[PDB]
Structure 1
Amino acid sequence: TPDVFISYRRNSGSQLASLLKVHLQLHGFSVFIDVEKLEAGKFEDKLIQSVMGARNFVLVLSPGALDKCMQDHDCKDWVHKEIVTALSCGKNIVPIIDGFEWPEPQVLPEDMQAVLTFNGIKWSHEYQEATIEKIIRFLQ
């Protein structure tokens, strides 16, 4: 059981997600990110179960990262599925803000609007060590 699950958008947050993984691992956290820990089998069940296993849900909110979730009421988008799983399970959700614009709740499907109520951490390129140290304070 990894302690932290990192959810991110491939096209805009892959580098920040990877950087969070390295830092969190250096500070002793077991981290789940797909490219390191998603292995053999049907990936839908493996991903969802890996969200369920992690106490902490770190959400990389790069620019436009929730765009594909909009109008995704069938829950086909994978960031959407991961967020809903995290919310449903009562995870400690820690959004990471990297140029993300806060949207109106009503543009997001009802089952994920609650993600916007969690206190988010601004990623600071100029003060990255301080950002990392704050993220660690948020983890459990």
Structure 2
Amino acid sequence: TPDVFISYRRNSGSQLASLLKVHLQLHGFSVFIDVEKLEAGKFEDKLIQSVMGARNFVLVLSPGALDKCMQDHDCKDWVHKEIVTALSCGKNIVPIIDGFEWPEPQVLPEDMQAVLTFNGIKWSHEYQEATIEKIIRFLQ
């Protein structure tokens, strides 16, 4: 069972999510990211179970990464689904801030607004090694 689940937006967080995966693996964590670890079967169940199995939930907040969650009240968006699972299991949620702008909570569905209450790590292009070192300290 992986220690770290990486949740991210394909169109904006793909490279950072992969960079995060490489570094965390180098530091000894088993990492789930979809393109390498989501395998055969009904992905609805597999994704949710993969969130549940991982102690750490690393959320890549690229610019606009929560836009598709807004008014997604029937819970069809996958970042939304992953956050709600992580929240309801009391996971160690570690947001990674990469040009994300903090929205008013009321623009998000009520079941995921608590994600903004978790302490986030600002990603620094100039000081990436120090950013990674901080992420590792936040990890459990």
TM-score w.r.t. structure 1 length? 1.00
Are 1:71 and 2:71 an aligned pair?
yes
Instruction: Provide the secondary structure at the position in 2 that maps to 1:87.
Output: helix
RMSD (Å) for aligned C-alpha atoms: 0.2
1:1-140 paired onto structure 2 within 5 Å: 1-140=1-140
Deviation of 1:110 (Å): 0.2
CA distance in 2, matches of 1:122, 1:97: 5
Cα deviation 1:29-69 (Å, max 9, x = unaligned): 00000011000000000000000000000000000000000
CA distance in 2, matches of 1:20, 1:35: 14
CA distance in 2, matches of 1:108, 1:88: 16
CA distance in 1, matches of 2:119, 2:20: 17
Deviation of 1:11 (Å): 0.1
| Unmatched runs of 5 consecutive residues or more in structure 1 | none
CA distance in 2, matches of 1:17, 1:44: 21
CA distance in 2, matches of 1:44, 1:33: 15
TM-score w.r.t. structure 2 length? 1.00
Count residues in correspondence: 140
Instruction: Provide the secondary structure at the position in 2 that maps to 1:65.
Output: coil
Deviation of 1:114 (Å): 0.2
Instruction: Provide the secondary structure at the position in 2 that maps to 1:58.
Output: strand
Deviation of 1:79 (Å): 0.1
Cα deviation 1:98-121 (Å, max 9, x = unaligned): 000000000000000000000000
CA distance in 2, matches of 1:89, 1:97: 22
